[PDB]
CSV table of C-alpha atoms and ligand atoms in Angstrom, one decimal:
chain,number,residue,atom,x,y,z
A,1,UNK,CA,-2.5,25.6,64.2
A,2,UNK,CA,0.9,27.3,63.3
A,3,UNK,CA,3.9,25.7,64.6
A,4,UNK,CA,7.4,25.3,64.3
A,5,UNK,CA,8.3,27.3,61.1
A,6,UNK,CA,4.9,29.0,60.6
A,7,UNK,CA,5.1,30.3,64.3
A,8,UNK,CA,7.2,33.6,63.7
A,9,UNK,CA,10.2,32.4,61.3
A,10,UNK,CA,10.7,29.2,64.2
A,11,UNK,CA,12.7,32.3,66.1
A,12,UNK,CA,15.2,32.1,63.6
A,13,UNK,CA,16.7,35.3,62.3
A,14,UNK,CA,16.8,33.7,58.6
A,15,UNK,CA,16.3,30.5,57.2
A,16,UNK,CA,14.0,28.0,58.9
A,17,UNK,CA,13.3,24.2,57.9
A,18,UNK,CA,11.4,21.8,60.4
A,19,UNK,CA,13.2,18.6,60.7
A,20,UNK,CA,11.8,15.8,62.4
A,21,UNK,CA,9.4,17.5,64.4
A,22,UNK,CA,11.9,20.4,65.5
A,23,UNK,CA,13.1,23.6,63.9
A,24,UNK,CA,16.7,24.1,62.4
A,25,UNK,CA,17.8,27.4,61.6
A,26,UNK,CA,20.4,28.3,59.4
A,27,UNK,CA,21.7,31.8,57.5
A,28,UNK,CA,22.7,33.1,54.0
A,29,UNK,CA,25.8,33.0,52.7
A,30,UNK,CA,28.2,35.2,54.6
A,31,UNK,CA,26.7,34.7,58.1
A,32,UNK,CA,27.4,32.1,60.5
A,33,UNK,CA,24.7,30.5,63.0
A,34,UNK,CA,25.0,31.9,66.6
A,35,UNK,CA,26.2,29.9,69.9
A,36,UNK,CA,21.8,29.8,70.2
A,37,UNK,CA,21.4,28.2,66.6
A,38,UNK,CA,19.1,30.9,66.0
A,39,UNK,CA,20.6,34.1,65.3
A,40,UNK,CA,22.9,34.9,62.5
A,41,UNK,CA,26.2,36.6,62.8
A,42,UNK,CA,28.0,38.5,59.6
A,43,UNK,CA,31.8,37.1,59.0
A,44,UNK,CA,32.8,39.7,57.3
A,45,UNK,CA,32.4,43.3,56.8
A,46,UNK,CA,29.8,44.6,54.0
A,47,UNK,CA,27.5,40.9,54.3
A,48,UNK,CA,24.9,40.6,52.1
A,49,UNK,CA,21.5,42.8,52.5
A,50,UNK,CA,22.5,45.4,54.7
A,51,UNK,CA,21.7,48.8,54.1
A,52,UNK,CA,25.7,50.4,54.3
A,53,UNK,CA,26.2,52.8,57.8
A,54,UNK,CA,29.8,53.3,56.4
B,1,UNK,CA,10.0,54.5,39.2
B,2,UNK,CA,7.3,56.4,39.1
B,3,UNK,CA,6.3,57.6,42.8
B,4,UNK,CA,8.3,56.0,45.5
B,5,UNK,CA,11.3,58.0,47.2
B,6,UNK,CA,15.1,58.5,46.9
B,7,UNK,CA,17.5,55.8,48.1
B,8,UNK,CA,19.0,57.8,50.4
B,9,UNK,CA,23.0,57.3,51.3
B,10,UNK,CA,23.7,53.5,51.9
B,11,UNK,CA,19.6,52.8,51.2
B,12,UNK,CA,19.7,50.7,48.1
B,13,UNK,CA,23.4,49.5,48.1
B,14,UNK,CA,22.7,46.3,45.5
B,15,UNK,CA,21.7,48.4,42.4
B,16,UNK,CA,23.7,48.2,39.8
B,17,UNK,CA,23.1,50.0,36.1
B,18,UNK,CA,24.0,48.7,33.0
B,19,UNK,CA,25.5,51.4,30.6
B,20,UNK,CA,25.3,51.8,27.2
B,21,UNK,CA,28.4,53.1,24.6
B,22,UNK,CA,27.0,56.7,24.7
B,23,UNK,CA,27.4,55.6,28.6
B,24,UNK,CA,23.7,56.6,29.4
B,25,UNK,CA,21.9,54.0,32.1
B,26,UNK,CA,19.4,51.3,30.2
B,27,UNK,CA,18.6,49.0,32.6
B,28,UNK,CA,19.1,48.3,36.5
B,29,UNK,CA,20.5,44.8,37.9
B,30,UNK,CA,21.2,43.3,41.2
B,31,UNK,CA,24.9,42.6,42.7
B,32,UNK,CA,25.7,39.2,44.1
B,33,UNK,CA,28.6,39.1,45.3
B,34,UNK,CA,31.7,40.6,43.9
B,35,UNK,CA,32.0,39.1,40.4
B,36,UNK,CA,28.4,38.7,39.5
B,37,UNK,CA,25.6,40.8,38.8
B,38,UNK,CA,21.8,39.6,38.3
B,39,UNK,CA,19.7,41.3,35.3
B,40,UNK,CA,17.1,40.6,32.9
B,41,UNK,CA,17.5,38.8,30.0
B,42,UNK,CA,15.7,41.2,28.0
B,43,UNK,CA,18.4,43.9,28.7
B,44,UNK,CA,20.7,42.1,26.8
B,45,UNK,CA,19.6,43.0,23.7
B,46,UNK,CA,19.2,46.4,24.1
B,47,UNK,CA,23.0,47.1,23.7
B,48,UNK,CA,25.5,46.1,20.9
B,49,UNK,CA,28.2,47.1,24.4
B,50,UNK,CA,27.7,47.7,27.9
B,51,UNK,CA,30.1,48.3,30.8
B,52,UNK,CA,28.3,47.7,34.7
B,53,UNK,CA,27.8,50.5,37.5
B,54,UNK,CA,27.5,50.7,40.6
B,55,UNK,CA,27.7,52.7,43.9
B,56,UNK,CA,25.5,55.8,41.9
B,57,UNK,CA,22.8,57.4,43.4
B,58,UNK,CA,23.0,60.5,40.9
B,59,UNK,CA,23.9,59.8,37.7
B,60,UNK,CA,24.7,64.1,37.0
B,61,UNK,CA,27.2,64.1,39.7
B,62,UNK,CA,30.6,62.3,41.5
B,63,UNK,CA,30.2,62.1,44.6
B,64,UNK,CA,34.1,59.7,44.4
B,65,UNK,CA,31.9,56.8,45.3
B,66,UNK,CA,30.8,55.2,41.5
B,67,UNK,CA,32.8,52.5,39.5
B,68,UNK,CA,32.3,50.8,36.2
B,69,UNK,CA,32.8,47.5,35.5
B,70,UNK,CA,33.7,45.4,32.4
B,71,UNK,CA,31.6,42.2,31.6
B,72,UNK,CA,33.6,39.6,30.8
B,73,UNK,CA,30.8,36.7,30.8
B,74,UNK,CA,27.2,37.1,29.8
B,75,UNK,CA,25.5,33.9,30.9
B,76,UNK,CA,21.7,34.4,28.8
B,77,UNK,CA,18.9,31.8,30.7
B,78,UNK,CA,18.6,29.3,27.2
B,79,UNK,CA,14.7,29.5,27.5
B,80,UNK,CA,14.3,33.1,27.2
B,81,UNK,CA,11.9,34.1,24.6
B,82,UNK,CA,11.5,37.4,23.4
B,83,UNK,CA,7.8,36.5,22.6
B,84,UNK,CA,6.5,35.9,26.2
B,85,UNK,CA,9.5,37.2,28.0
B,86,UNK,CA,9.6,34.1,29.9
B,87,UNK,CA,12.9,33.1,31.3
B,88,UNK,CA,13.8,36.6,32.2
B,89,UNK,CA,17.2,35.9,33.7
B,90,UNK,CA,20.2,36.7,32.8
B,91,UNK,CA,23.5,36.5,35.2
B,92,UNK,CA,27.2,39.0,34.3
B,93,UNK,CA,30.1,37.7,35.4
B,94,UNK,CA,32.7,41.0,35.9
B,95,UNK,CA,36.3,41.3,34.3
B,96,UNK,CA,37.1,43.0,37.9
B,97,UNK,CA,35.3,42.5,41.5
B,98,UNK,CA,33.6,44.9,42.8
B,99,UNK,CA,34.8,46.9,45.6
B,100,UNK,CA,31.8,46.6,48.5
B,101,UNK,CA,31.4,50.0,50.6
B,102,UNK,CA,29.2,52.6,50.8
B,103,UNK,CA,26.6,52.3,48.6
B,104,UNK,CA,27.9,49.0,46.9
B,105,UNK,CA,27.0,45.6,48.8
B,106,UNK,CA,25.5,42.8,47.7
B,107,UNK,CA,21.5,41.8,48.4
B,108,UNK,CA,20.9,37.7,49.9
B,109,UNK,CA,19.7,35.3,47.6
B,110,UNK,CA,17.5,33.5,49.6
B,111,UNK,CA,16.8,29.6,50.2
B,112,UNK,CA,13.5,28.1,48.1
B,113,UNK,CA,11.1,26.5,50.3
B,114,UNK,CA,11.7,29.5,52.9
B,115,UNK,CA,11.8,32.1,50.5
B,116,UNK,CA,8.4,31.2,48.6
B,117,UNK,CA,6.9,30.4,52.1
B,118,UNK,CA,8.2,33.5,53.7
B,119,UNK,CA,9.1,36.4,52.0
B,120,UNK,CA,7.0,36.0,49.0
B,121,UNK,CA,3.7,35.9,51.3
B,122,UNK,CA,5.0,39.2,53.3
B,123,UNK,CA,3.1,42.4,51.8
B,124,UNK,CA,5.2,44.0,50.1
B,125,UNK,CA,9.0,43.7,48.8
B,126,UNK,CA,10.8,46.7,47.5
B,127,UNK,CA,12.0,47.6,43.3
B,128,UNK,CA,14.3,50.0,43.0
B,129,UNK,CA,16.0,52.1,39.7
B,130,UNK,CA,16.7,55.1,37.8
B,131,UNK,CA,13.7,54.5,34.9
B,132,UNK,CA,11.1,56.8,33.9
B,133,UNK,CA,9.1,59.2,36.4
B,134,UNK,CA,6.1,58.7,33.8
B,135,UNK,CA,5.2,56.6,31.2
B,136,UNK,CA,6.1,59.3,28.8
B,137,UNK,CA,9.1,61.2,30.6
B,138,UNK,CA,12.4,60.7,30.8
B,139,UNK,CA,14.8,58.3,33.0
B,140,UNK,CA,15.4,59.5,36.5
B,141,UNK,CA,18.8,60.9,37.3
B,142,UNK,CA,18.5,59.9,40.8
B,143,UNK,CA,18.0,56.5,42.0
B,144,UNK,CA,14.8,55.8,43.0
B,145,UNK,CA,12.8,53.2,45.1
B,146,UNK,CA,9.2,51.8,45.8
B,147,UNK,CA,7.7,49.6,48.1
B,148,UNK,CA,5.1,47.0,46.4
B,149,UNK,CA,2.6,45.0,47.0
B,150,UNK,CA,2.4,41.9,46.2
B,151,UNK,CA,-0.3,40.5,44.2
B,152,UNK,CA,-2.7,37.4,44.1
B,153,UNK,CA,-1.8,35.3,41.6
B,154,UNK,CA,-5.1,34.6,40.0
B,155,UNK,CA,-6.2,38.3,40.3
B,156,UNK,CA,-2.6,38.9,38.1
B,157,UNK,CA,-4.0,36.8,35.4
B,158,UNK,CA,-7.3,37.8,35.0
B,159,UNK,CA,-5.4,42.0,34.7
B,160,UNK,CA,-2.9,41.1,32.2
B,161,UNK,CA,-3.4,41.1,28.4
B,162,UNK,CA,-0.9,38.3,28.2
B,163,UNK,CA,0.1,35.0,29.5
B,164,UNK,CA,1.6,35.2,33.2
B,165,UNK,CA,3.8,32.3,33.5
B,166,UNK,CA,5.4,30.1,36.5
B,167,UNK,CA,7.9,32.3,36.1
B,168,UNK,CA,6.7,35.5,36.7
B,169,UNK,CA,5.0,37.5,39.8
B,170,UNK,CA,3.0,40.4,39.4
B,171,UNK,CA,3.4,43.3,42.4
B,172,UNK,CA,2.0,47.0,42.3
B,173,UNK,CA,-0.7,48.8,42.7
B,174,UNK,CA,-4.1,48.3,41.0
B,175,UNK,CA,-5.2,52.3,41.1
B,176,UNK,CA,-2.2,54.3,43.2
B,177,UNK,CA,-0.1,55.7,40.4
B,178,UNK,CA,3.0,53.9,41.9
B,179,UNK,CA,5.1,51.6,39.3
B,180,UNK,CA,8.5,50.6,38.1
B,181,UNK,CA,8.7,51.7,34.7
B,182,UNK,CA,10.9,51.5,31.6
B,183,UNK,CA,14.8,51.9,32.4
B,184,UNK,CA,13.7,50.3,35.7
B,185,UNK,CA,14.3,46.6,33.6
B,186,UNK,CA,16.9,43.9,35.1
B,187,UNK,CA,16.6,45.7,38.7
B,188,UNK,CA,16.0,44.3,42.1
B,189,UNK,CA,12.9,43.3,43.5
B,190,UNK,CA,14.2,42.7,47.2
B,191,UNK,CA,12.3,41.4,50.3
B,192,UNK,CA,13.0,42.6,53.8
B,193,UNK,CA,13.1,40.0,56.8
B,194,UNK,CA,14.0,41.3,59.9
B,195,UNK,CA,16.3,44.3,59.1
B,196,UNK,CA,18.0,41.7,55.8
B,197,UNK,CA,17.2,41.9,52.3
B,198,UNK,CA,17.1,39.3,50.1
B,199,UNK,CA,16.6,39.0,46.4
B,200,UNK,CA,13.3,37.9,45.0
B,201,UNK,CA,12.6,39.3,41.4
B,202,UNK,CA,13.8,41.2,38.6
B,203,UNK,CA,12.2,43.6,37.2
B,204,UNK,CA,11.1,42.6,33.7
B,205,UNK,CA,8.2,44.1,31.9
B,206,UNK,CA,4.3,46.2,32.8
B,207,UNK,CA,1.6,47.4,30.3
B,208,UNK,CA,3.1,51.1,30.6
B,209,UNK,CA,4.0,52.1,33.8
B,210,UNK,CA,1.2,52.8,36.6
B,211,UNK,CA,-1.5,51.9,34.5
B,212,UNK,CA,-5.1,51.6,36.1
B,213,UNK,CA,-5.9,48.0,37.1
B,214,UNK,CA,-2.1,46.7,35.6
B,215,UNK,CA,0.7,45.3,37.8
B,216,UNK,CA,4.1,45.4,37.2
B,217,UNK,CA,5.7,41.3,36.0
B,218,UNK,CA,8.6,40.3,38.2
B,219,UNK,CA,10.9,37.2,37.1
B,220,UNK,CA,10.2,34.5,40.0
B,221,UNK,CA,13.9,34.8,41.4
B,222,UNK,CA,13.0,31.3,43.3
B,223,UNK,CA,12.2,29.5,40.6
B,224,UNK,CA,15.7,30.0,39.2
B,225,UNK,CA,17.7,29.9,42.5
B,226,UNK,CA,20.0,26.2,41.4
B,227,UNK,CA,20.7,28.2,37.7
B,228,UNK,CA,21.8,31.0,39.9
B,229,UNK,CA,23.9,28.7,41.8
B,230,UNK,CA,25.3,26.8,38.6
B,231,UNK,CA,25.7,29.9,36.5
B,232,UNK,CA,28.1,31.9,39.5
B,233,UNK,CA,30.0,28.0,39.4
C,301,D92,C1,4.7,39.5,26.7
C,301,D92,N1,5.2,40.9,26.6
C,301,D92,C2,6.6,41.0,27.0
C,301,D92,C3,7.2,42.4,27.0
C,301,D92,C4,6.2,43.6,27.0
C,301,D92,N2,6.5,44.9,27.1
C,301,D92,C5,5.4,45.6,27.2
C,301,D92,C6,5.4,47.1,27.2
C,301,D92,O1,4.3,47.7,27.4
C,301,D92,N3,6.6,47.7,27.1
C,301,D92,C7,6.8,49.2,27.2
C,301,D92,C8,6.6,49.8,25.8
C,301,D92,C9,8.0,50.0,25.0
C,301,D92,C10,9.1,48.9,25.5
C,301,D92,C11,9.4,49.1,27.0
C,301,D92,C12,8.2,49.6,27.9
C,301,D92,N4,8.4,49.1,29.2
C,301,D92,C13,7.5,49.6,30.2
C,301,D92,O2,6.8,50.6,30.0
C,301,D92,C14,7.4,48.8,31.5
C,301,D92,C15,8.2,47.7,32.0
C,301,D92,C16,7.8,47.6,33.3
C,301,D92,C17,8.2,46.7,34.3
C,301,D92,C18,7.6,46.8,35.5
C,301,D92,CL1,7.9,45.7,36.8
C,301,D92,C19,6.6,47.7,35.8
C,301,D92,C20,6.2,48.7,34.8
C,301,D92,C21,6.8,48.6,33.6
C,301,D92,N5,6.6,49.4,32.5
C,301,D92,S1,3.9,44.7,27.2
C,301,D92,C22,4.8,43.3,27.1
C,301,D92,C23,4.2,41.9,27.0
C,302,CA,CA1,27.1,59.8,40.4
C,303,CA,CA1,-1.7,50.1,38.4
C-alpha cells in the first residue's frame, strides 16, 4: 500500500520526506517552496536543471 | 556516445569539457553552480594542464556562445584508486564564475534518501558528451546524448569482469548498440523528475563502448552527495 511519499512524489514537485505521518515537501537549491508547500518556484533566472529557452 | 542524438540548442546546458594544452576535449563534467564543476577522478590524470568549457555544442565552430575556464582548485576524492576506479569523483573549483545563459546552466544535485528512492528507480536517466561514435573511431565534434537504462544491480555484477562497488551503478543496454564511450569520462549522468534534472552519476568507465551483454559504470553521485557539499565549502 503506497502512501505518502511512494504515492506519486507525495504531490510534491521535488523533494519529499514523510514526517510524522504527513508529507513535507521541499526544493533544490535555487527554488523556493510555493504558498501550497508543494510546488517549487525558481528565484532566480537560469535555476538549476532547466533546459535554457533563452 | 555512441547512438543517442544531438543536444539540440539549450538541451544539455550542464556539460562542461575539460581541455587539454593542444586544447582538444578529453573528458566531459558536470556544472554546479558557478564556481564548481563535477568530473571524474580518473580524468585528472589524463592531463599535465587543462582549462574548463562550456556552452559548446560543436567543438569545429563559434557560434559566440563558448567560454573557457581556468581551474584554480582540483579537489581529487582521497580514496580513488586507479586499480578499481573506485571513488570516481573529483570536484574543480574555477579561477572565474561561469556566466549561466544559453546553453550554460547548472544540473540539481539532488537530496539522498529521495534521490536513491526516486530517481535512481525511474527507467532511465540521461549521459551526455562529445566521446567516441565507436569503440574504434574518433571523438564526436558535436555534443551528443543518450537516454539509459538503468540496470539491476545483481544482473551488473554477474556482466562485469570486475568488481562493481557501492560506488558505482551500471546503466545501458545489454544488446542495443547504445553506450557512452571513451572521451564521454567525467560527464553527467542526469535524471529527469517532472520537467528538472538532477545529477546522479558520472560517467567513469565500460568494457569498450556498446559491448554485447556490458553496461556502462556510473559513480553513485548519492553516495558522495556531503563530500560534494564539503568540497564546494
Ligand atoms: C576496474 N577497471 C577500471 C577502468 C577500466 N577501463 C576499461 C576499458 O575498457 N577502458 C577503455 C580502453 C582504453 C582506456 C579508456 C577506454 N574507455 C572506454 O572505452 C569506456 C569508458 C566508458 C564509460 C561508460 Cl559509462 C560507458 C562505456 C565506456 N567505454 S575496463 C576498466 C576496469
Ligand atoms: Ca563551438
Ligand atoms: Ca551493451
Amino acid at each position: 500500500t503506497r502512501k505518502l511519499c511512494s504515492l506519486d512524489n507525495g504531490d510534491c514537485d521535488q523533494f519529499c520526506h514523510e514526517e510524522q505521518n504527513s508529507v513535507v515537501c521541499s526544493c533544490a537549491r535555487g527554488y523556493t517552496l510555493a504558498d501550497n508547500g508543494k510546488a517549487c518556484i525558481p528565484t532566480g533566472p537560469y535555476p538549476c536543471g532547466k533546459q535554457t529557452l533563452e | 556516445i555512441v547512438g543517442g542524438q544531438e543536444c539540440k540548442d539549450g538541451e544539455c546546458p550542464w556539460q562542461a569539457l575539460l581541455i587539454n594544452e593542444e586544447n582538444e576535449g578529453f573528458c566531459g563534467g558536470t556544472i554546479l553552480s558557478e564556481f564548481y564543476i563535477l568530473t571524474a577522478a580518473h580524468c585528472l590524470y589524463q592531463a599535465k594542464r587543462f582549462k574548463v568549457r562550456v556552452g559548446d555544442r560543436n567543438t569545429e565552430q563559434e557560434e559566440g556562445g563558448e567560454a573557457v575556464h581556468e581551474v584554480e582548485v582540483v579537489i581529487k576524492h582521497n580514496r580513488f584508486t586507479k586499480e578499481t576506479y573506485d571513488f570516481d569523483i573529483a570536484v574543480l573549483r574555477l579561477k572565474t564564475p561561469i556566466t549561466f545563459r544559453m546553453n550554460v546552466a547548472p544540473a540539481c544535485l539532488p537530496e539522498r534518501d529521495w534521490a536513491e528512492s526516486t530517481l535512481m528507480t525511474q527507467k532511465t536517466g540521461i549521459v551526455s558528451g562529445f566521446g567516441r561514435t565507436h569503440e574504434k573511431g574518433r571523438q564526436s565534434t558535436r555534443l551528443k546524448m543518450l537516454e539509459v537504462p538503468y540496470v539491476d544491480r545483481n544482473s551488473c555484477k554477474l556482466s562485469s569482469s570486475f568488481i562493481i562497488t557501492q560506488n558505482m551503478f551500471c546503466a545501458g543496454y545489454d544488446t542495443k548498440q547504445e553506450d557512452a564511450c571513451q572521451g564521454d569520462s567525467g560527464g553527467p549522468h542526469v535524471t529527469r523528475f517532472k520537467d528538472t534534472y538532477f545529477v546522479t552519476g558520472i560517467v567513469s568507465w565500460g568494457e569498450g563502448c556498446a559491448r554485447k551483454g556490458k553496461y556502462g559504470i556510473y559513480t553513485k553521485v548519492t553516495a558522495f552527495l556531503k563530500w560534494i557539499d564539503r568540497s564546494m565549502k
